Write a protein that binds this ligand. Structure first.
Ligand SMILES: CC(C)CN(C[C@@H](O)[C@H](Cc1ccccc1)NC(=O)O[C@H]1CO[C@H]2OCC[C@H]21)S(=O)(=O)c1ccc2c(c1)OCO2
Lengths: 99, 99
């Protein structure tokens, strides 16, 4: 599909057995999801943006379905105000910028 | 152009007659540039990111050329970690997400 940018590019994702709304974010190196209790091991991480840094938990090899397109990679979980799909997964679903 | 996302979508911009590098950021509503000098009046404003809120200088109706495409709109100047082009200008250059 083609998504115009008049409004936030929010799409439905499926992760850890839950459906959620998330931003397709070309400005995000990594994928950052709102606090959720995923099972398995994780490693602490800090990611910075406008306003400073937040502490997140890094989970590896997590399956995510983005608008019906399957992907698997690293997912960060922490106190983000918005679910953010980063480039690590956008590449896997064939997402491109076009103008 | 069609831009894949295996690297950061960084592009050259021209603003105030000066060239800079900026990130095409579909997760940003607004355009936020690092500290710089711009002519004209500005208003103090607040913007929030993943880590909190920062004070910025809002410049309205600013000419800015992005990868050879012209836009005229609001530019926020403040302590952002990187120059980001937000949807307010991405729409003006006809940018869309595609997968
Ligand atoms: C600032 C850029 C370089 C990085 N950010 C991605 C942005 O898309 C961010 C994603 C974002 C969106 C909404 C709330 C919090 C983060 N948007 C943002 O800060 O935009 C601000 C400017 O316009 C306004 O509209 C949105 C907030 C304002 S981010 O959220 O802090 C971020 C995401 C994944 C990351 C990372 C940083 O480091 C490595 O992995």
């Amino acid at each position: 599909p083609q998504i115009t940018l008049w409004k936030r590019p929010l799409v439905t994702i499926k992760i850890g057995g839950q459906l959620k709304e998330a931003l397709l974010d070309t400005g995000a190196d990594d994928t950052v999801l709102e606090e959720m209790n995923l099972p398995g091991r994780w490693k602490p991480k800090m990611i910075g943006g406008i306003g400073g840094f937040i502490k997140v938990r890094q989970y590896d090899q997590i399956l995510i379905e983005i608008c019906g397109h399957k992907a698997i990679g690293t997912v960060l979980v922490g106190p983000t105000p918005v679910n953010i799909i980063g480039r690590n997964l956008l590449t896997q679903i064939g997402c491109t910028l076009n103008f």
